[PDB]
Ligand binder design. Structure first.
Ligand code: HEM
Ligand code: HEM
Lengths: 480, 480, 480, 480
């Protein structure tokens, strides 16, 4: 195999620059060097705005139970159907090469290359979020991100944002358990967090939540375990998940679905479209869908794991987004950031390409590798053999329930009630882990009012938790 | 054929946005709409900084005569060998959709997809150039480019540069004949302008110049003729050349080489490596090489004619650049601008991709469509099966003739002598044309000193042309 | 002034590259050369996807009549207030350096640097548009743009689209008069085309349309006149408007507003919010607002006219978009394309920069010249003196009138009615010019049933015009 | 202070998206939301290809001793002259948010904002490099970078490359002492590694090396110490250096220079221009130049530390690059990558901007914030007030010493000899640490031939090291 330039010219000497004499300066005419150095200079692209640290693998999804009752999604009609998937697991706040032992939700992303298009599942392990409207997401992230001067994450900064956005209480309850540091990607669950809509063949729509349950079980690290691991291996989760697949101990998860009829949405003490809210298995049963097996590592990380883009509003027919106000901003954000991060034709890259043929009138854009060449780039047109709309594929109408449009916060926020229930649903071990992690984190806040507000927010959720935090801190909340 | 999103989801309704009601505001969840518009939003890329305006087509090069004597270049070894080519012809100064009736050199670019890699011929119709050092190219372009306030080309600006850089005189002789406006791309010659080095299997090197000769002959347009054409068709040359191919009237050119022994370089009243100097056919004979035939229009202009990059420094084994100081900056410039204009991985696109297989240790970069998957991305390595250098392909050594490096103008400039020779080689018809065009261009110069300088420069070249310019302008030339 | 590199190093020799000898190859260590070339290599950015060709100038808006009864827009409160403006005028379909003699609507864009933010008016001269839903815009553009193979605009393609999308009929009536070729940018009107919403201090909203009247009158070119101009000057309108300002003949326009109560939207034979429909002066009267004077040319085309971004959705308090399905896509499109075309931080460039101060929690992005330095990059936050929201500026609620969202075409299409009205409002001159231009255009269509359809669409609008086109073409229309 | 959009419009509600009803879907017309999310989507830019993990601060350089004897560099003429500096320290191989406890050279970069332009010092702590020609850098970096499939650094890969490129031996001797892991940025030295050239007022040139000596002393961490620190703090060095400055304990370094007359270069058992070679203090004395004090943290990491670009070939008059083949490729590469990573106009950003004024003929390029507005954008020109060249600043000619140019490896490679002396110059504790670290590293190599090669490479430098490695490994080297 001959070494070549990008021009296919064979290289004779890959060790020496062309110089003006044996010990003289380098020549501008060294095309081979400059081509090599110039490409090297251009290897890097922007990391993900969040969830930059991650691990991806290939596998298959296998449907066990037909879902035709709830959705007319092609792949979900018949038990036994298998769909290729690519998955990516990730942390959130810190960058590429950041340790995998930090406290963070863990991203859980699955691209399904379906016969009717790509569907992206893009969730986290943790079943709720800090906030309920996309308007706040840059703020939340900016608050959690390293301090913009010091480049170091500072709890004084994020506890500020969080205390003043008290809907974050419930998420705080989850993230400061030991479930805030999974032991690895293969030992964690997945959650859609948002409701979506599934519509069946007759146009009945239900609200659905999605649920991944690992065959290896949920396994977490305590703070001291995380520190121990960090010192030895800053790539532990990636390492462990890569080795398991390479050794043939294939990571597997089961997919379950929760179904809530639209006519029942007022029936709870919470808005079911609020992303700060969970649907307890107790109140809404999990129904088995199928199982994902990841059985093949990437061939190349950059081209596969780094270059994939997912979007929760990338859905197949039979699937629609919910009105969830946090989800609604995501629909835009993901693809929007990918046009910048990966490129305008990012959907043409092997890792992003659908299994279904792409036939449309879109054209051009930088690096047009899979340019459709028909000169007929407009629709409607006169030609019968060019791509046409298939009316049966139109997304059905959905209901509107208000007489006004504008900036209108939902009515039943219930910022503390469900958070309290989540606390009381925990075992003693979980409640003690939560207290020690919260205390350790609040000891790092440098503004008293923020600490007071944090303890107060927790107190409203559960009085005894708030009392314990008060004692450990030691800040008396009694006057308030 | 089903119409689809870039995700492979069949589109039901390609005519209506999803709105909050039949006469309501558009929804951010309209993924189909946003994908479509966002891609549309990104269709465009930067135009070529020069030669933006152009036309491309595919064809074949047939070598008629073996070049073994002069070069070891594989495709040139045997009579009858055929190489696929892609050619682009161009104006220079104005942008995309610029009239093709403007006075400019015309670009003549040919990519040869060779058994030993790509070779780009990148020349103009005209046999010489305005300057002799790349250092001056941005200045020269900026002077000819539309005034940066008015956005209209102004003779007052570029005559300023050209008079103050007297080496331009020779090019001014050519450019202001009627050969400044070719009738069509098919009715023009091609010139390498610079000499290059060819090296044979034995290791002898010769200076060479390359030459394209139109089967349809050289045909030009007077000013008034160009004005007539321009009013009815601003894409006239692209239109003619497109139609010619489609009608089966394939444009052909014969290629010729001029050969100069490096030992004979100081035997002239000019420096043969000076880009402002021609190699007259009567001094160095044209030797036939073969013939190019353009026999297929692009399937798609954007992915072919817009997205192609050429570099005079993209050479196959057997070829090397000369030390011509204008050429030497071009070796860098072209591939550098393509990395910007087209993208880091521009050599991966089909129009740029070699016929010879590419095998190397380069990786990543934006849109890594053709990523090499082997994890061995470093050389030297322990693996016999990975790409290896092939020493017999090592570019040969070349003489150094000085004991200092630095910023050092050539001795024999001869800024006016050959410019004179060229004029006295013209027919009386061409000399009248030169005068009419010169006068009509010099009439637009608002600084009398620039006008005087032009006149002196032409005078030093040929005293009769000088006095004629003076008489017509009318500024007598007895003082200075 | 000493000539310097971008590093601030004074340059000794700007004429010669650094070479390995007087006649030797160029050195890679020539930083000065490489910096200069590499920057030249990067001068170009993408041109606008539409309206690439254009001219900009600075000026002033003077408000003459208070608009307080209709809007609480600060700058519109007091008769006498001046706002600085930047305006850009353009053709539509072809690229940079394309003739300004071509048949095209003309862009009319004005940035108002107001005390309460930038307001961008982004209209055309013609008062209607070809289509009424943004979903169709890429298709409409693609059909009108050069054929993706020949690189020449083809009536056979765009008629194909326009006939198949018969809502276009009204716009064809307009664009095929002589008004399709304005004599220049100063000699044309401007239209909002869409209605917008103005909201007052008491919270009443009205539908509004905006209207620019030239002090110079509306002046147009016939096909033959445009053809004669084109031969001589392809920059004719830019040239005219530039010179006019230097000469002190300041291009001026009066601004007029047409008002409509949301209560009266059903009292017409058309949907007021349909972009294919005009609001006739004699049905909704023009009310005078103020005058714009353009009194200063750009210092630099690139940094001003090239680099400016407008968006019709960039509105000041007191203004809101209507539900016009074409407008609603524009809200997204413009800013979207600018982030790609100009850059993520395009709003930080002087030409785009507001007069009002920018204070928020956004950060970073490529080329962050005006980066906000405060480490408090999140809101809410504990700091009294960091930026805070001002609730009285909250865009107020707007009625919703449907109980479903979805892909739902409007009721009163009236694709031909008002198109006929328009034709019958024309003088005999205009009707003659329309006939000539249409026939000349329809003679270039190569497909029978497209021509037939065009004549039928025009016939449905007006029987006599239908007959005359039928007569001239010449197909009898007795059957169908 | 009012919260505003990038348009300067006051925001009233920064908490709620505009939605089609209180519990309905989000509106495309929420300009405020989309501007916000869309800028957030674009915050990230590519990290540095190498040395992505870093820390920057401002300060001052004070010249203690005139250097006029050796250079005519303006800032170095007079004792007591003070120049502003920005410094950045960094690791090498891993990405942003990588631990600072990893084994790697440590980058030491200093930008001097001089009265005659910017000078960049761009060195490492360690005084030699792994390779001696730029041709090999991508390969070396690829071998050291995470395996492109596992995303984990693998000694089996980098030992492959290193053993097969035995010139690396000397650097291995350095990097595998505990100096492979400095305790922080303020407790490490700096080295130019390369010689450069200094030219005085008379045109005499000497070769110089540059040396930074920390007031705080050189302090390192053993492997176990590094492990302990890593578990607790992955930002330790950034943390420590930022706190020192913030507490008023300013990091200081003394700058020293070593001088070698060009007439003495043949006098050593090594080529003094080989970047794998050190110039021992006892062979060429260090001469005090001045001191750097870092006294001011950044206001903003992104705009300062992230967006700064340095290039060792960015030199002031009085300074020139040496013909060092490693240094030669760096002259091109730094500015090349920055054009991509930061932007074509990267030199216009506050952190990169010279102290000295920038006056030249370059124009345009993306985000032209500091566009020079003069319409005279070409040189030579007629105007005496426009930027002119200053011939006294012309870079002096330098010697050439060969009669050929081509790919020509230096003759006295001495790959093992100096490496031997470096080992023999070590203390016994340094020698034990070296052995422990090498053994720990070579136990992770999985190919016997590479371990044997490594051991043989060390043996050739020093027999007792070769034996100690052989015994500890346990690999028999006797048969060879
Ligand atoms: C009544 C309908 C329309 C009018 C009057 C109009 C007018 C204009 C004008 C005047 C410009 C040039 C602005 C400038 O000088 O910078 C422009 C550019 C543009 N238009 Fe529109 N247009 C219309 C419809 C649309 C639609 C439906 C879309 C797609 C949703 C669209 C997308 C664009 C884009 C992407 C640009 C490029 C802007 C830039 O690069 O900054 N236009 N249009
Ligand atoms: C002994 C030789 C070398 C030393 C001492 C060295 C040191 C450094 C340092 C300290 C930085 C970080 C600058 C900063 O803080 O921004 C850096 C970055 C970099 N280096 Fe070198 N390096 C060496 C060799 C090379 C070579 C041979 C090349 C290839 C031609 C190279 C290419 C690069 C590139 C492309 C960057 C990224 C710069 C940017 O994005 O701004 N280095 N190096």
């Amino acid at each position: 195999k001959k070494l070549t330039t990008n021009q296919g010219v064979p290289i004779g000497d890959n060790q020496n620059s062309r110089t003006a004499g044996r010990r003289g300066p380098t020549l501008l005419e060294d095309y081979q060097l400059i081509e090599k150095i110039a490409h090297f200079d251009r290897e890097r692209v922007p990391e993900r705005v969040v969830h930059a640290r991650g691990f991806g693998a290939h596998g298959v999804f296998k449907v066990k139970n037909s879902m035709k009752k709830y959705t007319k999604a092609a792949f979900l009609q018949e038990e036994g159907t298998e769909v290729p998937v690519f998955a990516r697991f990730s942390t959130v706040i810190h960058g590429t090469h950041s340790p995998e032992t930090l406290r963070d939700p863990r991203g859980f992303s699955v691209k399904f290359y379906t016969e009717e298009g790509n569907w992206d599942f893009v969730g986290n392990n943790l079943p709720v979020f800090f906030i309920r409207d996309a308007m706040k997401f840059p703020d939340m992230v900016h608050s959690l991100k390293p301090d913009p001067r010091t480049n170091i994450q500072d709890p004084d900064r994020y506890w500020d944002f969080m205390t003043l956005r008290p809907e974050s209480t419930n998420m705080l309850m989850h993230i400061f358990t030991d479930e805030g540091i999974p032991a690895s990607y293969r030992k964690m669950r997945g959650s859609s967090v948002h409701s979506f809509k599934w519509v069946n063949a007759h146009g009945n729509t239900v609200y659905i939540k999605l649920r991944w349950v690992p065959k290896e079980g949920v396994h977490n690290l305590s703070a001291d375990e995380a520190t121990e691991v960090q010192g030895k291996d800053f790539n532990h989760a990636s390492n462990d998940t890569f080795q398991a697949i390479e050794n043939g101990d294939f990571p597997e998860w089961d997919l379950f679905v929760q179904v809530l009829d639209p006519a029942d949405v007022e029936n709870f003490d919470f808005d079911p479209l609020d992303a700060t809210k969970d649907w307890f298995e107790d109140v809404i049963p999990f129904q088995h869908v199928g199982t994902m097996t990841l059985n093949k590592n990437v061939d190349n990380y950059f081209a596969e794991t780094e270059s994939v883009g997912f979007n929760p509003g990338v859905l197949v027919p039979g699937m629609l987004p919910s009105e969830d106000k946090l989800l609604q901003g995501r629909l835009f954000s993901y693809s929007d950031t990918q046009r910048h991060r990966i490129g305008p034709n990012y959907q043409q890259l092997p890792i992003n390409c659908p299994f279904a043929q792409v036939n449309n009138y879109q054209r051009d854009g930088a690096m047009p590798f899979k340019q459709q060449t028909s000169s007929v780039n407009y629709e409607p047109n006169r030609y019968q053999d060019e791509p046409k709309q298939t009316p049966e594929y139109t997304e059905d109408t959905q209901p509107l329930h208000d007489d006004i449009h504008g900036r209108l916060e939902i009515e039943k926020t219930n910022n503390f009630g469900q958070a309290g229930e989540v606390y009381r649903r925990m075992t003693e071990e979980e409640q003690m882990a939560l207290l020690n992690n919260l205390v350790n984190d609040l000891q790092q806040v440098r503004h008293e009012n923020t600490v007071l507000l944090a303890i107060c927010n927790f107190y409203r959720a559960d009085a005894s938790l708030g009392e314990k935090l008060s004692e450990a801190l030691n800040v008396d909340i009694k006057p308030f």
